[PDB]
C-alpha cells in the first residue's frame, strides 16, 4: 500500500533543503513518499487551511459565491496584493490572510470546531484565537492527513454541499495545460518552529488523479518557490507530468 522512495531526497538535498513529498495514485490506491516518518508528522497548516476555511464559509453562507467582493479594510499591509478588494478566487491565489481571518470570525469557534471534526481534518483542534489558530494555535495536520482530506474533497464526499466543494476546487485551480491540471494550495508556517512551506493538492490526468502533499524546511521566504519546483521534479521523475 505504501512504499518509501528515498531517491527523492536528492531533490531536497540539491537545494540544501529537507522535506517530504507524499504521492497517492488514486487508480491503484497506492502511496509513495521519500520519508515515511515525516509524511506522518503534524505541522501547522498555515494557509493550506484556506481550503477547509473556504468550504465552511461557503456552506454556512458567510461567502455567497466566488464573485462576492470582500473589500480591503484600508489597513496597509506589507504584501501589496493584499491592499485591494478580493473575491474567493483571488483571495486563494494571493493567500490573503486578512480576508480569511474575517471568514473565521463570522464562522465562529463552535461551528468551526464542529466542521473540522466532520471533515476529520488533522487533529481537529482549534485551540487558540479563532482568527489565527491555523497560524499559531493548536491545530496540526500531517502530509498524509492532507491527502486523506483532499481525496474526500475531490470525490465530493465531505459533509458540505456538492456546490461548496465544486466552488473550492475551482478556487484551487493553479495550473492547466494540455497534459495536466493542478488544483492545490500553498502554505508557509513561520510562527512556531520548525518553519515550513507546504504545497498540497492534486494532478488531474486524462485517466488518473495523483494526490500530493509536501512540506519542507523553510528558514526564510527566499526558498518558497522550491515548494512547487521540488514537487514538480518528483512528478517528472515518476513520469506523472512531462
Ligand atoms: O504560502 C505562500 O505562497 C505565501 C505565503 C504568504 C503568507 C501566508 C500566511 C501568512 N500568515 C500570516 C502572516 C503573513 C502570511 C503570509 C504570503 C504570500 C504572498 C501572497 C501574495 C503575494 C503577492 C505579491 C508578492 N508576494 C506575495 C506573497 C505567499
Method: X-ray
Smallest CA-to-CA distance from 145 within 116, 120, 163, 170 is with: 120
CB contact at 8 A, 44 and 192: yes
Residue 165's nearest CA partner among 142, 143, 183, 141 is 183
Q: How far apart are CA 116 and CA 113, in angstroms?
A: 5
**Beta strand pairing call for 30-33 and 2-4:** parallel
Instruction: Output the CA angle 94-95-100, nearest 5 degrees.
Output: 125
CA 205 to chain centre: 20
d(CA 143, CA 137): 18
Cα–ligand 1 centroid distance for 220 (angstroms): 12
Beta bridge partners of 200: 185, 213
Residues 97, 133 contacting (CB under 8 angstroms): no
Distance CA 124, CA 221 (A): 28
Q: How far is the CA of 225 from the centre of ligand 1 (A)?
A: 12
Q: How many CB atoms lie within 10 A of CB 233?
A: 18
Instruction: Give the side-chain half-sphere CA count within 13 A for 114.
Output: 10
In this structure, the residue with its CA closest to atom 14 of ligand 1 is: 97
Cell numbers representing residue 30 in the block: 497506492
Nearest CA to ligand 1 atom 20: 94
Helix (H), strand (E), coil (C) string for the chain: CEEECHHHHHHHHCCCCCEEEEEEECCCCEEEECCHHHHCCEECCHHHHHHHHHHHHHHCCCCCCCCCCECCCCCCCCCHHHCCCECHHHHHHCCCHHHHHHHHHHHCHHHHHHHHHHCCCCCCCCCCCCCCHHHHCCCCEEHHHHHHHHHHHHCCCCCCCHHHHHHHHHHCEEEECCCCEEEEEEEEECCCCCCEEEEEEEEECCCCEEEEEEEEECCCHHHCCHHHHHHHHHHHHCCCCC
90 Cα–ligand 1 center, Å:
13
| Residue 91: CB atoms within 10 Å | 24
Q: Which structural domains are found in the chain, ordered by start?
A: 1-242 (3.40.710.10)
User: Atom 26 (ligand 1): residue with closest C-alpha?
Assistant: 79
How would you list the strands of the sheet with 2-4, edge to edge?
2-4, 30-33, 19-25, 209-217, 196-204, 181-189, 173-176
Farthest-apart Cα atoms in the chain, separation: 51
Name the residue among 86, 114, 115 with its Cα closest to residue 101.
86
Q: What is the resolution of this structure in A?
A: 1.8
Of 46, 5, 2, the C-alpha closest to 24 is: 2
Amino acid at each position: 500500500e505504501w512504499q518509501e522512495n528515498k531517491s527523492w531526497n536528492a531533490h531536497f538535498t540539491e537545494h540544501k533543503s529537507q522535506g517530504v513529498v507524499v504521492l497517492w495514485n488514486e487508480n491503484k490506491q497506492q502511496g509513495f513518499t521519500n520519508n515515511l516518518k515525516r509524511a506522518n508528522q503534524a505541522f501547522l497548516p498555515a494557509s493550506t487551511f484556506k481550503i477547509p476555511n473556504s468550504l465552511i464559509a461557503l456552506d454556512l453562507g458567510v461567502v455567497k459565491d466566488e464573485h462576492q467582493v470582500f473589500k480591503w479594510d484600508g489597513q496597509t499591509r506589507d504584501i501589496a496584493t493584499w491592499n485591494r478588494d478580493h473575491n474567493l478566487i483571488t483571495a486563494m491565489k494571493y493567500s490573503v490572510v486578512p480576508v480569511y481571518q474575517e471568514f473565521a470570525r463570522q464562522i465562529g469557534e463552535a461551528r468551526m470546531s464542529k466542521m473540522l471534526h466532520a471533515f476529520d481534518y488533522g487533529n481537529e483542534d482549534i485551540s487558540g484565537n479563532v482568527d489565527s489558530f491555523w497560524l499559531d494555535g493548536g491545530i496540526r495536520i500531517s502530509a498524509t492527513e492532507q491527502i486523506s482530506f483532499l481525496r474526500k474533497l475531490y470525490h465530493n464526499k465531505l459533509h458540505v454541499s456538492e456546490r461548496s466543494q465544486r466552488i473550492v476546487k475551482q478556487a484551487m485551480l493553479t495550473e492547466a495545460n494540455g497534459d495536466y491540471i493542478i488544483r492545490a494550495k500553498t502554505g508557509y508556517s513561520t510562527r512556531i518552529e520548525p518553519k515550513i512551506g507546504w504545497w498540497v493538492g492534486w494532478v488531474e490526468l486524462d485517466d488518473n488523479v495523483w494526490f500530493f502533499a509536501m512540506n519542507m524546511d523553510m528558514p526564510t521566504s527566499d526558498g518558497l518557490g522550491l515548494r512547487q519546483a521540488i514537487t514538480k521534479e518528483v512528478l517528472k521523475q515518476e513520469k506523472i507530468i512531462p
